């Protein structure tokens, strides 16, 4: 009630992980006298590259910036103007496409996993298809090998093989068939926004599958300016323009601190999801998601599909549990009213979808309370 609640206690769906040593690492940056892109950013990138097994990482200001950069690095004719993406993502994923001046073609959703319908994808690839953005939504890796096959066939068909940009905002630490995300031949964009697993306050990371892309990215993330050039004497050339997409030492310092604690919290994420997977089977009116075991997700949130959801919502509210949508389906926004397509898959789950708290911040008592409340019916 404006400045209150209902007697006591609430369970949040998202929360910010801030290592106690973060302020320490920040004070060291202030002591350095340099707040821009410095040695800490370099330190961060080496740390991340080590974990990911991909040396071609490029830290950026935010995940959205990483997506924007990734789309600029695409070399393809202006007549390939179509980007295939699903409307069940965060708006950043699709607004990045509009900012790049391209056209969105909506791809449907797999009601089993609430990720992109790879069947529907293959049908919609056309000669105009510039690229495809796949989102490992809420932490679950999309079938990458299958996607490779889909592209293999599309290439064999009409000349070009479309680029794939993986949106890994929710999927830090995730792997696919034993291989960490970032190492499957696609550009990948991680997010280090406050609510994400590894947070820099705000931040992001673009990993590249090749050296030529890597180099272009190192440059274009800062206006196209070689930062080691004698700029004072005007001795540099911008071969490809860019914007302010890089990450500064201030945020890199935070991310370095949270790397100390991210693994444990990721473990708890998966451990709580496991608990839910176990204790929520065979609940009437609740349909769990089917997850393939050849991959390991990150469970940004726990997605379920429910009957009589408005009641379920009321139930969670009374029980003091935050539950709902990460985002509205992006295609319903009036600013893309013209791109509407029939998406039967999503049309069938969107009134049933709901995300549940599953993060590291849940006490045992908390996850037991969610299960208790859910099983006690609605």
C-beta of 334: minimal distance to a second copy in Å? 5
C-beta of 351: minimal distance to a second copy in Å? 10
Q: Does 320 bind a second copy (CB under 8 A)?
A: no
Reply yes or no on whether 278 is catalytic: no
3-state percent helix, strand, coil for the chain, nearest multiple of 5 = 40, 15, 45
- Residue closer to a second copy by CB (options 4, 235) is 235
Q: Tell me the C-alpha distance between 131 and 184, whole Å.
A: 16
> For tokens 């539950």, what's the residue?
323
Q: Is residue 63 annotated as involved in ligand binding?
A: yes
Q: Is residue 85 annotated as involved in ligand binding?
A: no
Binding residue for a second copy (CB under 8 A) from 322, 339, 349, 371?
322
- Residue 224, phi-psi category: left (phi > 0), alpha (psi -120 to 50), beta (remainder): left
Q: Does 199 bind a second copy (CB under 8 A)?
A: yes
DSSP H or E run through 165: strand 163-168
3-state secondary structure of 315: helix
Binding residue for a second copy (CB under 8 A) from 43, 51, 201, 268?
201
Number of C-beta neighbours around residue 55 at 10 A = 13
Site for a second copy in 324-343 (CB under 8 A): 324-325, 327-330, 332-336
Q: Does 357 bind a second copy (CB under 8 A)?
A: no
Cβ 306 vs Cβ 129: under 8 Å:
no
DSSP H or E run through 109: strand 109-110
Task: Give me 238's structure tokens.
Answer: 């911008």
Q: Is residue 173 annotated as involved in ligand binding?
A: no
Marked catalytic residue, from 15, 196, 244, 315: 196
Q: Is residue 315 annotated as involved in ligand binding?
A: no
**Mind giving me the DSSP string for 122-181?**
HHH--TTEEEEEEE-GGG----HHHHHHHHHHHHHHSS---EEEEEETT-TT-EETTEET
The count of chain residues that interact with a second copy, using the rule CB under 8 A, is 61
Q: Is residue 196 annotated as involved in ligand binding?
A: yes
Site for a second copy in 220-249 (CB under 8 A): 223-225, 231-244, 248
Cβ 369 vs Cβ 322: under 8 Å:
no
- Report the binding-site residues for pyridoxal 5'-phosphate: 63-64, 170, 191, 196
Catalytic residue list: 196
Binding stretches for a second copy (CB under 8 A): 13, 16, 18, 22-23, 26-27, 30, 33-36, 61-62, 64-65, 68, 91-92, 95-96, 98-99, 101, 194, 199, 201-202, 223-225, 231-244, 248, 250, 313, 322-325, 327-330, 332-336
């Amino acid at each position: 009630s404006g400045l209150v609640p209902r007697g006591s206690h609430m369970i949040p769906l998202f929360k910010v992980a801030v290592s106690p040593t973060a302020l320490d690492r920040v004070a060291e940056v202030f002591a350095s006298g340099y707040l821009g892109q410095g040695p800490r950013v370099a330190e961060f990138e080496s740390a991340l590259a080590a974990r990911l097994g991909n040396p071609r990482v490029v830290s950026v200001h935010s995940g959205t910036s990483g997506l924007c950069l990734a789309l600029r690095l695409l070399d393809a004719p202006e007549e390939r103007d179509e980007v295939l993406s699903t409307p069940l993502t965060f708006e950043a994923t699709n607004w990045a496409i509009l900012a790049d001046g391209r056209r969105i073609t909506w791809v449907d959703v797999d009601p089993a996993t609430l990720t992109m319908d790879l069947d529907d994808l293959e049908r919609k690839i056309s000669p105009a298809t510039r690229a495809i953005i796949v989102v490992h939504w809420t932490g679950y890796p999309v079938d990458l090998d299958r996607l490779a096959g889909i592209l293999d066939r599309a290439e064999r068909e009409h000349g070009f093989r479309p680029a794939v940009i993986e949106d890994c905002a929710h999927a830090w630490g995730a792997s696919y068939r034993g291989v960490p995300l970032g190492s499957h031949g696609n550009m990948c964009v991680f997010s280090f926004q406050a609510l994400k697993h590894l947070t820099c306050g705000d931040g992001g990371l673009l990993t590249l599958p090749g050296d030529e892309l890597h180099e272009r990215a190192m440059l274009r993330r800062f206006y196209g300016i070689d930062r080691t050039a004698d700029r004072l004497r005007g001795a540099y050339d911008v071969a490809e323009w860019g914007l302010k997409w890089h990450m500064t030492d201030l945020n890199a310092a935070i991310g370095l601190a949270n790397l100390e604690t991210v693994d444990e919290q990721l473990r708890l994420h998966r451990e709580n999801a496991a608990f839910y997977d176990k204790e929520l089977t065979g609940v009437p009116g609740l349909e769990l998601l089917q997850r393939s075991p050849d991959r390991e997700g990150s469970f940004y949130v726990y997605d379920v599909k429910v009957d009589d959801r408005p009641a379920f919502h009321r139930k969670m509210e009374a029980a003091g549990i935050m539950a709902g949508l990460v985002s509205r389906r992006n295609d319903e926004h009036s600013c893309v009213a013209h791109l509407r397509t029939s998406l039967p898959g999503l049309d069938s789950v969107y009134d049933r979808m709901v995300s549940l708290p599953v993060g590291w911040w849940l006490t045992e008592q908390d996850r037991e309370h969610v299960v208790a409340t859910i099983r006690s019916g609605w």
